[PDB]
Symmetry: C2
Amino acid sequence: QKPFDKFFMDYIGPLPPSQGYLYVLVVVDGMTGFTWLYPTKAPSTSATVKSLNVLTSIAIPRVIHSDQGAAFTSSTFAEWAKERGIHLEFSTPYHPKVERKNSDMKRLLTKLLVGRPTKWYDLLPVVQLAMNNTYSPVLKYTPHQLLFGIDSNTPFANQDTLDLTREEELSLLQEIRTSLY
Amino acid sequence: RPQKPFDKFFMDYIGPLPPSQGYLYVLVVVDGMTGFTWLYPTKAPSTSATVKSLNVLTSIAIPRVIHSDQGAAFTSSTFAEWAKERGIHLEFSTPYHPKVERKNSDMKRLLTKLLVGRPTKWYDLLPVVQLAMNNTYSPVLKYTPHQLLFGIDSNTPFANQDTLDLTREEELSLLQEIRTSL
Ligand SMILES: [Mg+2]
Ligand SMILES: [Mg+2]
């Protein structure tokens, strides 16, 4: 299994409106557990296409898994997916623990963002950062080092703090580091 | 070149471009060390589009330095507040202080021509442009930018390295035209 092999995709929201954004598109790499978080104004197909255009600038996934929300089962999205040889796979009642982690993550994510009603847009990058750079007892590593190579030139100076200075950021990093698993 | 990934970004807008799907500019962000390039379509070369694009990019990591010219999008009170907060140092081209400046400038001309050459479809093709760029061998660093950012001995997420899994006519054309100039 490669990285960028299979994406797990879902929306959280509606959240308190931080700077005209209400939702977050949560994309999770199946192999690495690396999470990309995209703020959106609506859980639309257009918003999803915009977000995934940016993500798929890096690599085109083999499979994208989502529930059967309107944004994902629209024909526009199917067309978008077909155009680039992406196969969409949907949550059904009958086809196959990965979800258990994603559910728990999406729950923490919602708690973190709802709790910062005014600033969550601004701190969204901090949340992704802290999450992808927190250690997993199942992965033996962090999602970041799994994506960017285990022994690789790390883009961080203080692993204690991940180069976060302000107390909003630190209290956030704490909460994630502690509550994640 | 600087020490590590994310030490230094070079940032600039290209355009105006032929209005494709409501977009008119591209924010070009280049990592100093790796040469990795991120392309972000916007409707304006504005502060808010930059902050919005860079918030995505900097979810990966916070750069120590961003270098840019004195475009209004970069010199605004709002953008300065954004950087001071994220802890990023902004470094501008000045009359006193304009090697790898030629690389960036050439690349930004190439990009403008590729996108203006595809007046109504450049927006849809941007991901192809970015992907092609970061996965083409660089004579200057013996590797591809993707290799330098994601790992020399990381397994490439592509089956065929000559085509990079690309099938469409207008898309293989781009990979060809980019593989020439770079
Ligand atoms: Mg859902
Ligand atoms: Mg300029």
